[PDB]
Every structure is written in C-alpha cells, then in structure tokens.
C-alpha cells in the first residue's frame, strides 16, 4: 500500500529491486545492492505462464451461440432454445469467473510460498552463522563480504569456513 512471508514477517515489497520477482538485498561495508534471485523468478514466471496458457487451452471448447429463428406457433421451442443457450452461457461464465478466482488465490499463495521457500533456503544454509532478525533479514555474525554474499545468493554457502568470530562476538 496461506503462507506467511508476503505481507507476513516480511512486511512489504522492495521498489528498488526491479530485476526479478524475488531477490536479495545485501548491506555490507563494501556497498548496498538490490540483487535478484534467478532460477526462482524464472521458475515462478514459467509456472505462471504455464497456468495462464492452461486456462486459455481448457476454454477453447466453450459453447458458441448460433442464431435460430422460430415462428409464433413455435414459442415452446423458442423458449427451449433461449433457455439452452442462456444456460450454457451462464455455465461457462461461472466456469471462467470461478476459475479466475481460484487461480488468482493460488497464484498469490504460489508467490508467497516461493518467498518463504527462498527464506527457508537461506535459513538452512547460514544455520547458526547468522541471526534471524524476524523481518526476513539475516544479520551475519562473522565478517561476510561480497564473496560470501554471492555464495548465499548462489546456493553454495560453505558452513565450515566461517566459525571463529561468531563465538567471540557473542558477549
């Protein structure tokens, strides 16, 4: 202005970071950039376009109303035709609108679960070498520069490399 990340413990979005849908924001002594996590954004985009294309594909065989004419002594058949065409249009209108509603909530929950899964991926990598600040941040306990920033953003974070300074800094 289901999952608890988007509009959850992460309070709001980031206007500066425009490269992807989800990403990072590092703030060390060497600078402060707003990077984007690829292979999560691309997976989300692929899933979203696949979902949209399936919604287009499943609705190709709808009902097409044709014009049939009847005379004044064919009013029951005219009423039957009107009710058939209107009932099929109502059925497909309900199908389209209700499918839009469900897939909209599913898309929002999918984005939320993607953000929470990225959060959990970073949490499972840093382990105790960091500190969950509660808003989606991990204040590092050792000296972490760009070289370990890119490994956190990669998926190749090396836990045994950094454990001496964290214990000393704690009280």
Contacts to ligand NAG by CB under 6 A:
150-151, 154, 156
Over the window 70 to 89, marking each residue x when it contacts a second copy by CB under 8 A and - when it does not, the resulting string is x-----xx-xxx-xx--xx-
To other proteins, the closest distance from the beta carbon of 87 in angstroms equals 23
Over the window 27 to 66, marking each residue x when it contacts other proteins by CB under 8 A and - when it does not, the resulting string is xxx------x---------xxx-xxx-xxx----------
- Spatial contact of 114 and 40, defined as CB atoms under 8 Å apart: yes
Question: How many angstroms separate the CA atoms of 88 and 64, rounded?
Answer: 9
User: Which two structure tokens, joined as six digits, stand for 158?
Assistant: 């090396």
Over the window 63 to 102, marking each residue x when it contacts other proteins by CB under 8 A and - when it does not, the resulting string is -------------------------------------xxx
- Spatial contact of 22 and 36, defined as CB atoms under 8 Å apart: yes
- Cα distances (Å, whole numbers) of residue 20 to 16, 51, 148: 11, 19, 21
Burial of 2 (0-12, 13-18, 19+ CB in 10 A): exposed
Which of the stretches 15-23, 33-41, 92-100, 149-157 binds a second copy when contact is defined by CB under 8 A? 92-100
User: Which two structure tokens, joined as six digits, stand for 92?
Assistant: 């497909």
| Partner from ligand NAG, other proteins, a second copy, none binding residue 14, C-beta < 5-8 Å depending on class | other proteins
């Amino acid at each position: 202005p289901l999952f608890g990340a988007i509009a959850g413990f992460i309070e709001g979005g980031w206007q500066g970071m425009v490269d992807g849908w989800y990403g990072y924001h590092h703030s060390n002594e060497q600078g402060s950039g707003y990077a984007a996590d690829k292979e999560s954004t691309q997976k989300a985009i692929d899933g979203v376009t696949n979902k949209v294309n399936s919604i287009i594909d499943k609705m190709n065989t709808q009902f097409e109303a044709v014009g049939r004419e009847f005379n004044n002594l064919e009013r029951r058949i005219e009423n039957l035709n009107k009710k058939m065409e209107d009932g099929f249009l109502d059925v497909w209108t309900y199908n389209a609108e209700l499918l839009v509603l469900m897939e909209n909530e599913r898309t929002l929950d999918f984005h939320d679960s993607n953000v929470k899964n990225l959060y959990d991926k970073v949490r499972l990598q840093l382990r105790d070498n960091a500190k969950e600040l509660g808003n989606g941040c991990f204040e590092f306990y050792h000296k972490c520069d760009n070289e370990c920033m890119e490994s956190v953003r990669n998926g190749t974070y090396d836990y045994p490399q950094y454990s001496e300074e964290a214990r000393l800094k704690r009280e």
